[PDB]
């Protein structure tokens, strides 16, 4: 076995699994999902005695997901689900892609109202869509502003927002938000006169966030360790999982 040496021992046989996903979304201004998909990878860090054979079980085929495709570390034996002797230390067990039944962590709802030739009233609502007892964090909503913008007012009850002139966007940062909640920002965008004819091609509003679960739906069901020679067994292994779901491209046309 060219990725794992022979004399490995730990008194604490311990393992950690990391389900890392990024959810990509393109949504129309009234809420149709135009494109969506998750790219995931599972990373394992193991400190296990000897040459353990491991079995990774997840909810592939009431919580149950669809992998469109996926690829495996050299140690996974192909033929009917997932088996290996892992390398010692940290390594990437698998990489996968999902499109069906994704949990979109946020809905963005834009409202833009032209007020004469002078102002845009913009309202943006964000809805968290996941368990009440879970918190997203590092939320960033980014609202683009046109080239003739002379100044901007904003009010937001949650988080903090700044207009960044050099970037033609209002950036709204929220430290944390629980599931099943709603929040808004209001902005007035003040405009310089501009050449009347050509009209504003509105870029989409983008978000970033991190959520403590897998937008694809993936749940780790078990990580089985059988080591047939050494006097530790599966119950002796201490096991942890963590889910880190982050936005990729997450855009709502407006």
């Amino acid at each position: 076995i060219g990725w794992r040496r022979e004399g490995i021992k730990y008194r604490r046989n311990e393992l950690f699994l990391d389900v890392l996903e990024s959810v990509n979304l393109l949504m129309s201004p009234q809420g149709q999902v135009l494109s969506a998909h998750v790219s995931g990878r599972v990373v394992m860090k193991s400190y296990l005695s000897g040459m353990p054979e491991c079995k990774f079980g997840m909810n592939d085929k009431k919580q149950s997901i669809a992998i469109d495709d996926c690829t495996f570390h050299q140690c996974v034996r192909l033929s009917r689900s997932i088996s290996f002797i892992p390398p010692d230390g940290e390594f990437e067990l698998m990489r996968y892609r999902t499109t069906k039944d994704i949990i979109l962590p946020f809905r963005v709802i834009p409202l833009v109202r032209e007020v004469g030739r002078t102002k845009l009233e913009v309202k943006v609502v964000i809805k968290s869509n996941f368990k009440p007892s879970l918190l997203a964090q590092k939320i960033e909503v980014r609202i683009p502003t046109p080239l003739n913008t002379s100044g901007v007012q904003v009010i937001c009850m949650k988080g903090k927002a700044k207009y960044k002139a050099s970037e033609n966007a209002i950036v709204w940062k929220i430290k944390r938000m629980a599931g099943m909640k709603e929040s808004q920002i209001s902005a007035e965008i003040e405009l310089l006169p501009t050449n009347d004819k050509k009209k504003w091609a509105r870029p989409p509003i983008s978000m970033n966030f991190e959520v403590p679960f897998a937008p694809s739906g993936l749940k780790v069901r078990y990580l089985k360790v059988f080591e047939p020679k050494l006097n530790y067994s599966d119950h002796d292994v201490i096991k942890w999982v963590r889910y880190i779901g982050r936005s990729g491209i997450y855009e709502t046309r407006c």
Binding site: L17, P212, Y222, L223, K239, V241, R242, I244
Partner: peptide, 10 residues
């Protein structure tokens, strides 16, 4: 903060 990271796995 975060915290996270890890949860116990049965």
């Amino acid at each position: 903060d975060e915290e996270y990271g890890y949860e116990c796995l049965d």
